[model samples]
Each structure stands twice: as C-alpha cells, then as structure tokens.
Target: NLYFQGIVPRSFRLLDELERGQKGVSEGVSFGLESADDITLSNWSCTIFGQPGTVFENRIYSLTIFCDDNYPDSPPTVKFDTKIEMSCVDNCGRVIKNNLHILKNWNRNYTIETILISLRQEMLSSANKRLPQPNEGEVY
Candidate 1:
C-alpha cells in the first residue's frame, strides 16, 4: 500500500533513517536535514548551524546531499549550498570528496545523521575553529 502510494522500500528506509537522525539532532548536533523535493527521496537539503563557541557561531550554512540509486552502497554527494571558507570545503561550497573521511571511506551502514554530525564536528576542529571568515553570516 505504501509502495503503491509512492513510498517504496528504499524510501521507507530513508524515512526510518531520518527519524533516528531527528533524535540525534535533539541531543547536540546543530544541523537540519530534510527532503529537498516532495516526490523524490534521492535529493535532500541540510542546514548546518555554527557551533556556539566557534568563529562560525550564529552563521547558517546550507548544503545539498544527493543519494543515487546506489545509495547506502555508495555514499551520497554532499555539496554546500552556502559559501564558507573551510579546508574541507572548496570555494564553490562542495565538500572536498578526497579530504572528508565520511565521503572517502563510506560504508553502507553510514546514515545521513552521521554525515551531518561529522560536518558539525569538523567545524569545531582546531584548524577551522579560529579561521577568519570575511563575511560571517552572509550566504552564498
């Protein structure tokens, strides 16, 4: 019935994963994730909030994550929709595929929640913690 209603098993898996992710966000992770399109489960949007004690605090960053048909077996492509200077992120806002562990060493067991949590954790790292951002709160 759900499948006939457009909620395929894969989508169901995605929904379940997101449900668990929502719980994780409430605990401490400061980011938001949701489907970008109503009809497709392959595309999603995420909002990463700056950590309270970091230079990025109060600044909001947006990103797009794409999960192909090979999802879970292959990691999603996460691209930042906002502009921010970070080592792991390029000038174009794409997370450096080669530098990020979640992307480089992706596993079928990894969930979107883990990726967002890692991104928030990355912002607090020593290298990114005090870096000077030219226009802190402005979005690209």
Candidate 2:
C-alpha cells in the first residue's frame, strides 16, 4: 500500500506540505495555500514573527511563495509582501538568489519550512536585522 512510483507526483508533494502547515509552526512562521481549492497548487502565503532582540522584534512579516512546475527540483520564488531592506532582498521584495545561499545552493529535499526557518535566521543576522525596516502594511 506504500510503494511510491519512480517519483511522487507533484500534487502529492504539496499535500504533504499542507499537512505540516495545518498543524502550524509556533516559533518562527506559518504558511499554507493562499486558496484551499487551488488545483494549480502554486501559491502560498507565509507569516513570520520577528525574533526577540532584533530590530525586527514585534513585527510580523508577510511573504509570498510560488512553487512552479519544476518545484522541489528547483527553489520556489519567495517574495516579502511586507517591505524589507535586507541585503538579500531586492527593492521589489524578492529574495535575490545570488545573495542568499539557500536558493543559490538549492536541493530537491528542501521544503517550504526550510525557507521560512532560514529567512528568519537571516533577518536576525547582524547585517539585516540592524538595517532600516519599513513600517507595517506597506506592500512591494
């Protein structure tokens, strides 16, 4: 009843992630499909809590994640809907692949959770956490 095919169908992989998201992550971030009935299963919304002691403290960040047809094999496109001034993030709020090691050295085994975790860590890094961050509700 449990033998997989050559590889899992893409839908199954996303549903797998859905299970985790539904239970939720209390520490750093939480994410789920933007729309429950999305047959395309491509878009997700993630909310991250700023860690204590960083300039990001007391702020909640919103991000958009797009997992394309080639996902799992490739990294998803992650953009901060909440404006940020981190070096790895561009003016448009897109995380620059050349500036972030995760996407630069992407692997298929990584999951959506992997990203939120690291991005949170990056936000607390001396370079980004100390930088000027825009006030809430601004979109990019």
Candidate 3:
C-alpha cells in the first residue's frame, strides 16, 4: 500500500510543523538566491552531534533544502558550507570520509530538521566540528 511505501501521516505532520516554524522565524534564514534551481523550504534545523564533548559541543549548524518536484521519491542534495574536514570515522573510530555525502543514503522520510539534528549528533569529535573558513577566509 502507498501508506507503507512512503511517508506516513505522523511524519507528514512533523514535517509540516517544522516547515512552518522555519518560515515563521526568518532572522538568519538561508534562502536560495533567485537563480537557485528547484530550491524550496521543505524544512530544516541544526545541532551538533556524533562527536559530542569536542570543540563542536553545543554548536548550532545550518542546512538549506532544495526540494524538487520529484521529492518524496528522490532525496534532496544537502551540503555543509562550513567545509568540515574529510577525516571520516565510523562508530568504531576508523577513518573513512565517503559516508559524509548527504544524498547518498537519503530516504524520502527524512525531513530537514532531522537532517540537521543528525549532523549535530555526528559532531562528537573536534574533527566533526572543525569547519572551513568562508571564501573570504573568515569564520563568522
């Protein structure tokens, strides 16, 4: 059944709530430029995860959503402007960077809030919180 194949009612409710809240609070909101393609505010949130107790502890991050018409079937492309180092480590402390890609294992059920929360959790180590400087070589 379609219900078992994709998003459920409860998930949709949560997604809707998150999206609404995002729009309601637009202080430091990151909206796509007019030229950005297929980008829409599907919803998003940010927090530090994974490597907690490190430099990234209590660090809030940001993520932008670019929802395509084919959403719920195709995952949206997500990236970190902060430019975290590529020294990947698994649950066992082994270094591997390939798993950092956001869209790689994406499922339609994931909302922007969930994505940001997960990122926060992954920042358990200093490496995870070590972001790169912006184009001007400055961290604001």
Candidate 4:
C-alpha cells in the first residue's frame, strides 16, 4: 500500500540529490543553465526539497524563473512549477513582490543565486509545516 511504502526508502536515485548537488555546487548555486550565453537570459529553472520534520518533507519543488532584459532593475519573475499552498504565491504560480522582501525591493546587487536561496528558505520555515501541498511532480 502507498502508506506502507511511505515508511521505507531507497538510494541510488535518492543519494543522487547529494551526488548531483555536490558536483553541481562546485561554486555556483546547486543548478545548471541550459544556455549561458544566450541573450534570452529570461529562461531558467531550479528545484527545492522540503526540509525534514516539516509538512513539506521530501517534496521536490520545481520553479521556472525569468530575468528581464532590464534585470537587477526589475526583479526576476519566479513562478512555481509545482502546485503549492502559500500566501506569497498565486494560484497561477507567481511570487508576489510585496510579500517577499527580495521581490519587494529588487536590489541592483541581488543575483539569481540570491533569489533561489531565498525561495528555498521561505518554503522551509517551520511555519509552513501545516500548509498542505499538491502531489509531487504536480505542475501549475
């Protein structure tokens, strides 16, 4: 049963997170860019894991982020690819500016790495432990 399966776990595919993260994080954020030099710097993506002992535990969340040509001036658009229940996010997957400090102040010094980290932290806060979430891999 699904409930029974939940008590057990696996590796190879599991430790792959740390494996990929270790290799992927030599210096950059734990991520990969599809096209680095392209002018359309607007397209990018990432994922986050729900921290242990939290309502979101083990959930893998995906996001599609975009930086405008005038990025740094205007904050990047970070839309959730996975369905989630949160006030800072809209059902359409948009991250509201007024709620997220980083978006509210779109600083010129902030980078994608900064936003990515911020997003991850926002989800991991224990306060979010009670909010129910969509199925894993469920996209908006």
Candidate 5:
C-alpha cells in the first residue's frame, strides 16, 4: 500500500529542497517549481531560464520531474518539456538516458538545483557555445 510509506516524507524533503533552491538562485539561471497535481506530490513541474549573454541566453525551457514512491531509494525521472538538441540532451530535450550522473549513477544526495546547473553549463560548452539557433527565443 502507498499509504504510510516513505513517499510522503521524501516529498516533503523535495519540497524543502525546492524552497532552498529558490532562496539560493544561481547566476545565469532561474527556475520555478510546483506540484503537477493538486493533491499528489509524486510529480512536479519546473520552468528554467537561460541567462543572458550565453549561447542559450534568453531561452526558456520547461521540465517535468517525477518523484515516485520509491524516491530517495531511486533517482527521480527527469524529462524536458521542450525540444532541444544537445549531446547531453536528446531531441526531445530529455537528459540522455545513459548520462551517468542523472541516471546510471544517480544518488539521493543530488538535488534538482544541481541538475539545473548542469544543464545551464552544458549550453556554454565549446560545441554548443557558437552553434546557431534558428528560433532561439521561441519556446517549444
């Protein structure tokens, strides 16, 4: 039964992390988080903004993070709600499934903030830094 399981407690921890993330906003990035459902905390929605002057500057991206009942014991599922083409990201904007940090070697110590930061940094990499974006400002 899902009731009285560790899910509820883990969700509270996730919520706390989100709040802390907001308070400690990083440079070149901003994000918002909310429950995907009114009652269930299993799913969450996030919106991320790429900082100005960067390759991904002025771009907005969306994400969906799922914290299943097995969270803490397992890594949350993360998917991009937008379309992006990057080595670390698939055409669908999702982090590469084979990404060791996000999937293969995930640990509970990793927070959503860390994930977002990694994504923002990826945009500044040599390969993506000078790449031309046809519709840079347009959100997918």
Candidate 6:
C-alpha cells in the first residue's frame, strides 16, 4: 500500500513481513519525509529510540538517511545527531577501543528502525564498559 509519485518499481515484500509480525530490530517505529511521495527529490529523517535499561535509555536519537538511485544494493550513511563517548565497531568492521562505526552495513533487508535498535543494544552491552584510552603509539 505504498504510493509514490514517481515510477520506481514498487516492492511489497516488507509489507508482507510486517503483516506476519516480523519486527525491525528497533521495534518498527519510524516516519518518512514530508515530500516523500512527491516526484521531486527530498530528504528523509529517521528517529530511533534507545532501549530500556541502557545508557541511552529514554533518549530519542535522530539520523539522516540518503537512499540513492541504487538503494537496495547500497547502504545509506547514518550519523548520530547526539554525541556520547562510547566504544563501537569501526568502519573496517574492527572494534576500535571506543568509537561508533558508520552504519554502512545496512541493507534494504533492514529497516531504519532496526539500525537504531541495534545501536541501543550496543550501548547497553556489558562489553561497553570503559577501558584505558588508546595511547598515541597504540594500534588496536
């Protein structure tokens, strides 16, 4: 039941999944852009809620997603609007001592909702405890 002004090939597999109670990692809470249905290009905003019992609990984080012409095959660039000192998996898929990695691994198979949900889980994981900051000569 998605309607758009442009003629991009429409797909409904996600809608089907939704009907079956398949939940996004973020619990399926999101909103599309204002002009999303217009033929004209537009920017989209997505918000993900922090998980309960996590450091980010009750925090509403905002992010911007750019879906290019090659969307399904390519992942969007997602940046956190808020700043918090945290350890995260790095861009090369390696976990840096403590830094958030870009969400380039995102796939159409995943919705924006799932991305945020996963982030909150990461923030809450016991593994996120503070550790010694990396020294200038250290590479880890």
**Which runs in model 6 stand beyond 4 Å of their true positions?**
1-28, 34-42, 89-107, 129-140
Report the candidate with higher TM-score, 1 versus 5: 1
Instruction: Give stretches of model 1 more than 4 Å off.
Output: 1-9, 20-37
Q: State TM-scores per candidate.
A: 0.78, 0.92, 0.47, 0.71, 0.72, 0.52
Model 5, residue pairs in steric clash: none
Candidate numbers, best TM-score first, in rank order? 2, 1, 5, 4, 6, 3
Q: Model 4: runs farther than 4 Å from truth?
A: 1-23, 26-29, 34-37
lDDT (Cα, 0-100) at 109 in candidate 3: 67
lDDT for predicted candidate 1 compared with the true structure: 0.73
Over 66-119, each residue of candidate 6 has an lDDT whose tens digit, in order, gives: 445554444444554444334664433232422433354444565445555566
- Model 3 ranges off by over 4 Å: 1-20, 23-52, 86-102, 125-140
Prediction 5 TM-score vs. true = 0.72
lDDT (0-100) at residue 113 of candidate 6? 50
lDDT of 4 by residue, 1-140 (tens): 33442222322222333345446542223543435564444566666666666666777777777766666567878878888776688879888878788889877666566776776667666556677877777886
All models: lDDT?
0.73, 0.87, 0.44, 0.64, 0.65, 0.46
lDDT of 1 by residue, 22-88 (tens): 5545424433345435555777767778777988788777778887877777888888777777778
Select the stronger candidate by lDDT from 1 and 3. Answer: 1
Encode model 5's per-residue lDDT on 35-112: one tens digit a residue.
434444556566567646666677787787777777766777777776665667766666775753556677776666
Query: What's model 3's lDDT at 129?
Result: 57
Instruction: Look at candidate 2 and give me any clashing residue pairs.
Output: none
Tens digits of lDDT, candidate 3, 30-124: 33322323235343333223244555433344434445556655664455434344244333322233564444567666655444444554554
Q: Order the candidate numbers by lDDT, best to worst.
A: 2, 1, 5, 4, 6, 3
